[PDB]
Every structure is written in C-alpha cells, then in structure tokens.
Amino acid sequence: LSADQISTVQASFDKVKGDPVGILYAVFKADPSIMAKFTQFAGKDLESIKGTAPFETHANRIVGFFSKIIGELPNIEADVNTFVASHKPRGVTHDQLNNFRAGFVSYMKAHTDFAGAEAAWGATLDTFFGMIFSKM
Numbered sequence: 008l009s010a011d012q013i014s015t016v017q018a019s020f021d022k023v024k025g026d027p028v029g030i031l032y033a034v035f036k037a038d039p040s041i042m043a044k045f046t047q048f049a050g051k052d053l054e055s056i057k058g059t060a061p062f063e064t065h066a067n068r069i070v071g072f073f074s075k076i077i078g079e080l081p082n083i084e085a086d087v088n089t090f091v092a093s094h095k096p097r098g099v100t101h102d103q104l105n106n107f108r109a110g111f112v113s114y115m116k117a118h119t120d121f122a123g124a125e126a127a128w129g130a131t132l133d134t135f136f137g138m139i140f141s142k143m
C-alpha cells in the first residue's frame with residue numbers, strides 16, 4: 008500500500024462518502040444476518056427502514072469510522088484494534104466480514120466508474136481485512 012494507491016482510493020471514496028445510507032443498505036442486502044444483529048432493525052423490511060432516522064444515525068456512525076480509516080492509510084492498526092474490541096463480543100464472523108466487503112464493493116461498482124480504482128481498493132481492503140482476520 009503506497010501513496011499512489013492511497014491517493015486513488017481516497018479520491019474514489021470522496022465521491023461516495025456523502026451517502027452513508029446507501030452504503031449500509033448495500034451491506035445489509037448482501038447479508039441479512041448482519042442486519043439481524045441490530046435490535047433496531049431485526050425483523051423489519053430493509054426497503055422500509057432504509058429511509059428512516061434510525062438507519063441514517065447508524066449509517067453515519069459506521070461509515071463515519073470507515074471514513075476515519077480511509078483517511079489515515081496506512082496507519083490503521085489502532086483503529087482496527089478498537090473495531091475488534093467492540094465487535095468481537097458481538098460474535099461477528101469471517102463470513103459476515105467478507106459479505107460486508109462484497110456489499111461495499113458492489114455499492115462502489117454501481118455508483119462509480121470503479122474500473123480505475125479497483126486494484127488500489129483491492130490492496131486497501133486486503134490490508135484492512137488482513138489485519139482484522141489476524142485479530143478475530
């Protein structure tokens with residue numbers, strides 16, 4: 008992960024960072040078992056809650072932290088540690104983590120011309136999920 012790739016990803020992310028709700032929707036759609044861990048959304052129709060105030064509040068927190076991480080590449084270890092601390096006890100699995108990744112990338116491919124940032128994003132996400140998977 009070198010500066011050229013970091014700048015590419017951060018330029019790419021800047022285009023979509025104002026749409027937290029959309030990104031969280033894509034994740035929940037890729038894997039409903041992630042959605043079922045939120046007491047506030049479990050048992051509800053994703054298409055119906057996507058435009059409510061609770062969804063936006065959650066989305067802003069979750070994508071807000073992801074935004075922190077993208078902004079500080081590559082010095083992400085401390086934040087990954089915090090992530091593991093809050094999520095390890097919720098029983099998040101590797102399967103779910105990989106569906107989060109798949110959902111995010113599906114979002115990016117449907118909303119931007121992703122072809123030019125694809126390798127840089129690959130490097131970033133392989134590094135990030137690489138660290139998470141070493142810790143939980």
Ligand code: HEM
Pocket residue numbers: 040041044045046068069070072073090093094097099100103104105107
């Ligand atoms: C893919 C598996 C994941 C599952 C099952 C999951 C589940 C959850 C749950 C249950 C909460 C608590 C919601 C609440 O009570 O209000 C939460 C909050 C949060 N998640 Fe995740 N999450 C996942 C992935 C991630 C990832 C990849 C990030 C990195 C951006 C992340 C960042 C956050 C943040 C910042 C919060 C709010 C702070 C907190 O309560 O931990 N989550 N998530």
